[PDB]
C-alpha cells in the first residue's frame, strides 16, 4: 500500500471502490534504477488489498536488489556467477547471444521461465496488457538490458506490447555515450515500427517515456530534513504513471468522460516518445491555470525539450471537484485548448480531453502527448559529453607530455 | 635481480624453478585452478631484499610468470640517502612500467599490474605520534593500512544498501583496470553534521595512512562507500549526499571519471566512509 503522492492519498481515504485500473501493467525492473521503480510499482494495491502489478526486478548485481521492500525474493531475477557488468552494457547483450556466449540460449530459458511464471495464467492467459520495463540509462546491467529487449521484441518474445519507462543520466562520459546508444537503437526500431505497421496497428514497442535526471534534480531542490532525490524523483514519475491509470477507470464526468479505452489507444498506438505534465491547480483563474500547465510541460519530471509539433495524439483530464463552477465556465475551457494548442494545435491530431469529478478542493491537469519524434535533449547530451570527452583528451595529454618532457636524475643511484 | 638473473649467475634459472614451485603449491588448485584473483606483493622500498623484489617483480610479470595480475603494496622510506635512491630507482621502474603499460592496453582492458597502492614512513609516523604504554610505530602502521585493505575487500560482499549498493564487481574493475597508482582514505564519522563529515573525508585523504601528496587531477577512476547505520536518517538526507560529491570533487570532479559511490548499511553506531582513487599518476612524495 505505497501512497506517495498527495493525490494517490486523497483518492484512497476518499474512494473505498478503487478496484480496477484503465491499463494492466507487467513491471519489470532492470538495473537498479528500475529494480527501484519496479519495487514503488509493487507496493500499490487496490482498496480490497489485492496488489495492483505483477513485478519482477531483474539484475547481475545480487546486491542492489537486496533492499527491495515490496518485491518479495522469489520475484528477484538474478544471473549466475556474475557479480555486475561493470557501467558496460554489452556485458549484458552477451550473455543472451549464441555467437557470444553458449548457454546464451540457456538463460533465456529462466527468462522465459520466469516471465511465465509472473504474467500467465492458470490456463495460460497472459494476466497483462502490456509490460513496462524500468531502466536507468547509462549503466550496464540498466542499458544493457534496454538493448536486449529491443532484441527480444524482434523475435515476438514478448505476449504483448512493451512500454519502456527510461531515465536520462545526469553527467558522465561513459554514462552519456551508453545513454545515447541505447536511445539510438531505439529511434532506429522506431524508424522501422513505422514502416512495417499502419498508423492504426497496435505497435509491438508501445511508446517509450523519458525523464532527464538534471531536469529532475533542477526541479527538486526548488520545491525531518533529509531528501534523497532519486528517491523524489522516483516518487513524482511513478506515483504520476499510476495516477493516471487510476482516474480513467475510477472517476467520470457530466461532460466530457475520459475513459479507459481512451488511454489504452493513446498508449498502444502512436508507438513512439510520449510525455505528460501534472498540473496542480490551487488558484481558481486563467492566468494562474495557464501557467501551470504550461510549467508542467517545460519543466516538470517528464521533460526533456520534447518535439511536441511531431505528436501524432493527444490525451488529458483535469481531475475537478464537484462544485467549482469555474471548470464548466466555457472561458475556462478555451484557455486549455490554445494552451496545449501552443505545443500541437490539438485538431491537428487525434485525441480527446476530460474533466472528471472528484472529491476534493482543487483541480490536477494531467496532459499527455504521444507519438512524438526523439526529444532534443539527444542533441544537448550529445554536446553535454563532448565538452567532457574532449576536455578530458586535453587533461589526459596535458600530463602525459609533462611525463615524457621531465625525467628527474637518479645517475646518482644505479 | 642479479641471483636471478643467468647473465650475471649461471644457477639464476634454478632459482626460478623454486619460485615457480612454491607459487604452483600455495596458489594452485588440485587442477590448476590459481585459486588467487591476483597478487598483493608487500614492499619496504629502501631494504636490499623489498626493493630488489620489487624490480624482480616488475621484470617477472613481463615475462608472463604470474596466472594474474599484481597489485603492489610499497612503503616509502623516511630518510636515510642509500634507502632514498633505493626507493626512487624502483618508483621510476614503475613509472616506466606503467607508462608502457598505458600504450601496450587499452583503457578497457584488464592489466598485468593491477595497481600501486604507496604509503610514506614520514607521514604515517607524524600521524601516529598525535593519536598500556608502549607504541612500535611501525607495528600500528602496519595495522592500519593492512585492516583498512581488508576492510575495503570485505565490505561490498557483506553489506548493502536500499540506496546504493557497492558491490564486489565495482571493486575489482576498480582495482583491477586503471593500472596505475591507486589511495583510500579511511574516515571515521561520529559527529553527524556537514561540517564534520567533510573536514574528516579531507583529512583522510590529505593527512591519511595512504596519503603521499597524489595527483588527484590525474585520477580516471574512483570507488567509495559510507557504511552506515540502519536509522541513522542523516545519511537519507540528500544535502548530505551533495556534500560527499562535491567535498571529493575538489580532489577530481566525479562526473569526470568514472566510478560508483555507495552507502551500505551496518549494525553499528558511527559512520566509516572509505574514499578510493585509481589510475592516478606518480605522487609528488616522488619530488
Same mark, same amino acid.
Given at each position: 500500500?505505497?501512497?506517495?503522492?498527495?493525490?494517490?492519498?486523497?483518492?484512497?481515504?476518499?474512494?473505498?471502490?478503487?478496484?480496477?485500473?484503465?491499463?494492466?501493467?507487467?513491471?519489470?525492473?532492470?538495473?537498479?534504477?528500475?529494480?527501484?521503480?519496479?519495487?514503488?510499482?509493487?507496493?500499490?494495491?487496490?482498496?480490497?488489498?489485492?496488489?495492483?502489478?505483477?513485478?519482477?526486478?531483474?539484475? /547481475?548485481?545480487? @546486491? +542492489?536488489?537486496?533492499? *527491495?521492500? !515490496?518485491? %518479495?525474493?522469489? =520475484?528477484?531475477?538474478?544471473?549466475?556467477?556474475?557479480?555486475?557488468?561493470?557501467?558496460?552494457?554489452?556485458?549484458?547483450?552477451?550473455?543472451?547471444?549464441?555467437?557470444?556466449?553458449?548457454?546464451?540460449?540457456?538463460?533465456?530459458?529462466?527468462?522465459?521461465?520466469?516471465?511465465?511464471?509472473?504474467?500467465?495464467?492458470?490456463?495460460?492467459?497472459?494476466?497483462?496488457?502490456?509490460?513496462?520495463?524500468?531502466?536507468?540509462?547509462?549503466?550496464?546491467?540498466?542499458?544493457?538490458?534496454?538493448?536486449?529487449?529491443?532484441?527480444?521484441?524482434?523475435?515476438?518474445?514478448?505476449?504483448?506490447?512493451?512500454?519502456?519507462?527510461?531515465?536520462?543520466?545526469?553527467?558522465?562520459?561513459?554514462?552519456?555515450?551508453?545513454?545515447?546508444?541505447?536511445?539510438?537503437?531505439?529511434?532506429?526500431?522506431?524508424?522501422?515500427?513505422?514502416?512495417? /505497421?499502419?498508423? @492504426? +496497428?497496435?505497435?509491438? *514497442?508501445? !511508446?517509450? %517515456?523519458?525523464? =532527464?535526471?538534471?531536469?529532475?534534480?533542477?526541479?527538486?531542490?526548488?520545491?525531518?530534513?533529509?531528501?534523497?532525490?532519486?528517491?523524489?524523483?522516483?516518487?513524482?514519475?511513478?506515483?504520476?504513471?499510476?495516477?493516471?491509470?487510476?482516474?480513467?477507470?475510477?472517476?467520470?464526468?457530466?461532460?466530457?468522460?475520459?475513459?479507459?479505452?481512451?488511454?489504452?489507444?493513446?498508449?498502444?498506438?502512436?508507438?513512439?516518445?510520449?510525455?505528460?505534465?501534472?498540473?496542480?491547480?490551487?488558484?481558481?483563474?486563467?492566468?494562474?491555470?495557464?501557467?501551470?500547465?504550461?510549467?508542467?510541460?517545460?519543466?516538470?519530471?517528464?521533460?526533456?525539450?520534447?518535439?511536441?509539433?511531431?505528436?501524432?495524439?493527444?490525451?488529458?483530464?483535469?481531475?475537478?471537484?464537484?462544485?467549482?463552477?469555474?471548470?464548466?465556465?466555457?472561458?475556462?475551457?478555451?484557455?486549455?485548448?490554445?494552451?496545449?494548442?501552443?505545443?500541437?494545435?490539438?485538431?491537428?491530431?487525434?485525441?480527446?480531453?476530460?474533466?472528471?469529478?472528484?472529491?476534493?478542493?482543487?483541480?490536477?491537469?494531467?496532459?499527455?502527448?504521444?507519438?512524438?519524434?526523439?526529444?532534443?535533449?539527444?542533441?544537448?547530451?550529445?554536446?553535454?559529453?563532448?565538452?567532457?570527452?574532449?576536455?578530458?583528451?586535453?587533461?589526459?595529454?596535458?600530463?602525459?607530455?609533462?611525463?615524457?618532457?621531465?625525467?628527474?636524475?637518479?645517475?646518482?643511484?644505479?
Amino acid at each position: 500500500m505505497v501512497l506517495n503522492s498527495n493525490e494517490l492519498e486523497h483518492i484512497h481515504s476518499t474512494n473505498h471502490s478503487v478496484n480496477d485500473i484503465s491499463i494492466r501493467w507487467g513491471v519489470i525492473g532492470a538495473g537498479q534504477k528500475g529494480n527501484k521503480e519496479a519495487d514503488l510499482f509493487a507496493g500499490y494495491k487496490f482498496s480490497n488489498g489485492t496488489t495492483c502489478y505483477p513485478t519482477l526486478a531483474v539484475n /547481475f548485481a545480487e @546486491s +542492489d536488489m537486496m533492499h *527491495l521492500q !515490496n518485491i %518479495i525474493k522469489e =520475484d528477484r531475477i538474478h544471473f549466475d556467477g556474475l557479480k555486475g557488468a561493470a557501467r558496460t552494457p554489452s556485458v549484458v547483450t552477451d550473455l543472451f547471444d549464441p555467437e557470444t556466449n553458449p548457454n546464451a540460449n540457456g538463460y533465456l530459458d529462466k527468462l522465459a521461465q520466469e516471465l511465465g511464471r509472473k504474467f500467465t495464467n492458470e490456463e495460460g492467459e497472459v494476466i497483462v496488457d502490456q509490460f513496462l520495463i524500468c531502466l536507468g540509462a547509462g549503466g550496464g546491467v540498466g542499458t544493457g538490458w534496454g538493448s536486449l529487449v529491443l532484441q527480444l521484441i524482434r523475435e515476438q518474445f514478448f505476449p504483448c506490447p512493451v512500454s519502456m519507462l527510461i531515465s536520462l543520466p545526469s553527467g558522465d562520459p561513459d554514462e552519456i555515450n551508453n545513454a545515447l546508444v541505447l536511445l539510438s537503437e531505439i529511434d532506429e526500431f522506431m524508424r522501422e515500427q513505422d514502416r512495417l /505497421f499502419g498508423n @492504426s +496497428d497496435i505497435k509491438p *514497442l508501445a !511508446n517509450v %517515456i523519458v525523464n =532527464d535526471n538534471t531536469q529532475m534534480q533542477r526541479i527538486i531542490e526548488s520545491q525531518n530534513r533529509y531528501v534523497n532525490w532519486k528517491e523524489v524523483a522516483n516518487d513524482n514519475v511513478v506515483s504520476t504513471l499510476h495516477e493516471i491509470n487510476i482516474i480513467p477507470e475510477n472517476y467520470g464526468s457530466d461532460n466530457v468522460t475520459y475513459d479507459p479505452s481512451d488511454l489504452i489507444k493513446l498508449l498502444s498506438i502512436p508507438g513512439r516518445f510520449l510525455t505528460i505534465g501534472k498540473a496542480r491547480i490551487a488558484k481558481f483563474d486563467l492566468h494562474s491555470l495557464e501557467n501551470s500547465i504550461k510549467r508542467s510541460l517545460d519543466e516538470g519530471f517528464f521533460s526533456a525539450e520534447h518535439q511536441f509539433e511531431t505528436a501524432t495524439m493527444y490525451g488529458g483530464f483535469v481531475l475537478r471537484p464537484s462544485n467549482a463552477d469555474f471548470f464548466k465556465d466555457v472561458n475556462t475551457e478555451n484557455r486549455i485548448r490554445n494552451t496545449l494548442g501552443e505545443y500541437k494545435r490539438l485538431d491537428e491530431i487525434a485525441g480527446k480531453f476530460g474533466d472528471p469529478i472528484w472529491d476534493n478542493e482543487y483541480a490536477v491537469c494531467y496532459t499527455i502527448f504521444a507519438g512524438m519524434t526523439m526529444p532534443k535533449r539527444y542533441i544537448s547530451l550529445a554536446r553535454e559529453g563532448k565538452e567532457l570527452a574532449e576536455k578530458q583528451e586535453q587533461l589526459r595529454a596535458e600530463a602525459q607530455r609533462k611525463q615524457d618532457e621531465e625525467k628527474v636524475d637518479i645517475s646518482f643511484a644505479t
